[PDB]
């Protein structure tokens, strides 16, 4: 279960944005660490909105499944603060924030090798999940966090972690699901409870498209009704200008769930690009 953290030991600081029915804040946790040394630890405080408290179970189950595993590419959960009025997840703070914002800001400093490294790390995380037969259900660049920037003078590649899925698509309003096209696969638009390992393979492809597109959002110009018809007409996303992963993207975003490649196969395909 989750380590229960006291309101008294948490300081809330600046807002870092929003998720679905959530707000995130940078914060500080007072704790006793190794050797009994006192620390003031930077943390991410994720707060379920007051007006959506009926989603509290899905909110914590999302973080819970994530926290019964340990892996270098998965965001750490420190605990929960059930205390009082609010429902709060206390997670590790990641310096450089979401990948989608980072891509947009640094679009012109990010080359093919950077993208390949991040894609490989994300595939490793998803491979780990697949081996444990655990569904994430919300893979997207917004839910990928950058721990460390690239350093091309000390050899260091960038390093990412995948954050928790948030409130499951199985219990979310239809309108939110439709807006999440094309991350949510077609079979889940027809029936959200078609949530399957195959689900994350589709969303992985959509996330690769993001990575290759400098933080653009695919189909952003389409409203929810046009997004629905995009799936009905069985369209594929356009290749990004940097089209090196275009085939991989389309192979993952296969309208037939059973034909989507394993993350083993995906990683093998990723390792094949270079010279
Ligand atoms: C789990 C987690 C851990 N650490 C962090 N850290 C973290 C650091 C920095 C930012 N910035 C926000 C503002 C940016 N600019 C300057 C103004 C407007 O864009 C600058 C970057 C950040 F959003 C997040 N976030 C998370 C986490 C958990 N869920 N989510 C989703 C809901 C987004 C993120």
Author numbering: 536 to 810
Share the article's original sentences:
JAK2 protein contains seven homology domains (JH1-7), of which JH1 (residues 836-1132) is the kinase domain, and JH2 (residues 543-824) is the pseudokinase domain. The JH2 domain has no catalytic activity but could negatively regulate the activity of JH1 and inhibit the kinase activity of JAK2. Janus kinase 2 (JAK2) hyperactivation by JAK2V617F mutation leads to myeloproliferative neoplasms (MPNs) and targeting JAK2 could serve as a promising therapeutic strategy for MPNs.
The results showed that FM could bind JAK2 JH2 and JAK2 JH2V617F protein with the KD values of 3.14 and 5.21 µM, respectively, indicating that FM had a better affinity for JAK2 JH2 compared to JAK2 JH1 and JAK2 JH2V617F. We obtained the crystal structure of the complex of JAK2 JH2 and FM. Two nitrogen atoms of pyrimidine-2-amine in FM were found to form two hydrogen bonds with the carbonyl and NH backbone of V629 in the hinge region of JAK2. The hydrophobic interaction between FM and the surrounding amino acid residues of JAK2 could also be found in the complex of JAK2 JH2 and FM. The benzene of FM could form a hydrophobic interaction with the side chain of L551. The I559 of JAK2 also interacted with the pyrazole ring of FM with hydrophobic interaction. In addition, the other hydrophobic residues near the active binding site also contributed to the binding affinity, such as the V610, F628, and F631 for JAK2. However, FM is different from previous JAK2 inhibitors because of its unique ability to selectively bind to the JH2 domain of JAK2, exerting its function through an allosteric mechanism.
